[PDB]
Design a protein around this ligand. Sequence first.
Ligand SMILES: CO[C@H]1O[C@H](CO)[C@@H](O)[C@H](O[C@@H]2OC[C@@H](O)[C@H](O)[C@H]2O)[C@@H]1O
Ligand SMILES: CO[C@H]1O[C@H](CO)[C@@H](O)[C@H](O[C@@H]2OC[C@@H](O)[C@H](O)[C@H]2O)[C@@H]1O
Ligand SMILES: CO[C@H]1O[C@H](CO)[C@@H](O)[C@H](O[C@@H]2OC[C@@H](O)[C@H](O)[C@H]2O)[C@@H]1O
Ligand SMILES: CO[C@H]1O[C@H](CO)[C@@H](O)[C@H](O[C@@H]2OC[C@@H](O)[C@H](O)[C@H]2O)[C@@H]1O
Lengths: 141, 138
Amino acid sequence: MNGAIKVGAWGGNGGSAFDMGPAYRIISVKIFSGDVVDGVDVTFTYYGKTETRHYGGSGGTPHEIVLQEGEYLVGMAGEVANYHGAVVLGKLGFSTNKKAYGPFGNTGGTPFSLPIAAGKISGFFGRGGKFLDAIGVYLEP
Amino acid sequence: AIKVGAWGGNGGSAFDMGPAYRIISVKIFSGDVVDGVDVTFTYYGKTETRHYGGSGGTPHEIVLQEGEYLVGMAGEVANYHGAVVLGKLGFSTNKKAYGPFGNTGGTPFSLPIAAGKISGFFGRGGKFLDAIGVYLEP
Ligand SMILES: CO[C@H]1O[C@H](CO)[C@@H](O)[C@H](O[C@@H]2OC[C@@H](O)[C@H](O)[C@H]2O)[C@@H]1O
Ligand SMILES: CO[C@H]1O[C@H](CO)[C@@H](O)[C@H](O[C@@H]2OC[C@@H](O)[C@H](O)[C@H]2O)[C@@H]1O
Ligand SMILES: CO[C@H]1O[C@H](CO)[C@@H](O)[C@H](O[C@@H]2OC[C@@H](O)[C@H](O)[C@H]2O)[C@@H]1O
Ligand SMILES: CO[C@H]1O[C@H](CO)[C@@H](O)[C@H](O[C@@H]2OC[C@@H](O)[C@H](O)[C@H]2O)[C@@H]1O
């Protein structure tokens, strides 16, 4: 709504829906992984107030992406597959107009990729439970 | 503008349809792979048609009804007798899913659109549909 563009929601239908909504500016993204992707922590700006959100499960190790001045998320890729009877993100990575990150996780599966030729990622939405079942993004020029 | 993707190889020649006011229909030509696609859409009062890719293949057409948009595109890019091209391609409207069309698998890709729509295409084409991307709008 309000002219938002939300693409994807890659993963399984398990867990419970989460939605960060779009950010005025993303400060950092911390991906937590082990065999698969556990969760994602996002620190951003909204209404001139800094916020942090915790999505997915609490396990895994942290991998942090800090966006410098003028750096933006222009790509997201990963893999979805089964893990103990549940379809979730086995791998996840991002790219910025400066460098690529990840992928993080170790469980292979059905790949997916979202290279962005024009525009950037501005927020996240998806599904979380014990792990990160599904992840999608908000886009903007 | 929001341009996502460009799934496929680096062969062929670049093509950019640019955004449309409203897409009318899309025809996908496929055989072993995805030969090409035709797009009929309105644009500032005029009705236009564009073709990307080669001339081979059999067509599969998607005709959008009133208040019907493309909210998804899936397929598979792979190495066909030496050329990295789209081996399979399909689309989804807010009411039905089409294809994918083509019979050559490879590394998959998919783009469900929870909010917004596909307003145009861009990519690369030659004898076949080398690569394809889309423009997105609210
Ligand atoms: C099976 O355990 C491995 O895979 C899990 C899923 O990716 C992952 O969460 C596990 O990591 C641990 O989770 C619990 C935390 O308290 C630990 O610090 C963390 O290492 C593990 O990688
Ligand atoms: C191990 O189960 C927990 O973690 C899973 C992966 O994160 C997650 O999918 C599970 O959620 C359940 O999935 C099946 C649905 O029918 C349930 O309503 C949902 O809670 C669970 O969080
Ligand atoms: C069979 O070759 C034609 O069809 C291919 C698939 O569509 C296409 O990739 C080919 O394009 C050439 O690829 C190699 C480049 O170096 C050339 O410049 C390009 O024309 C060709 O159209
Ligand atoms: C190898 O031939 C099959 O796969 C090709 C790539 O998808 C495809 O183009 C071929 O289709 C034919 O192309 C030439 C036209 O004149 C034919 O009518 C058409 O069937 C074929 O599917």
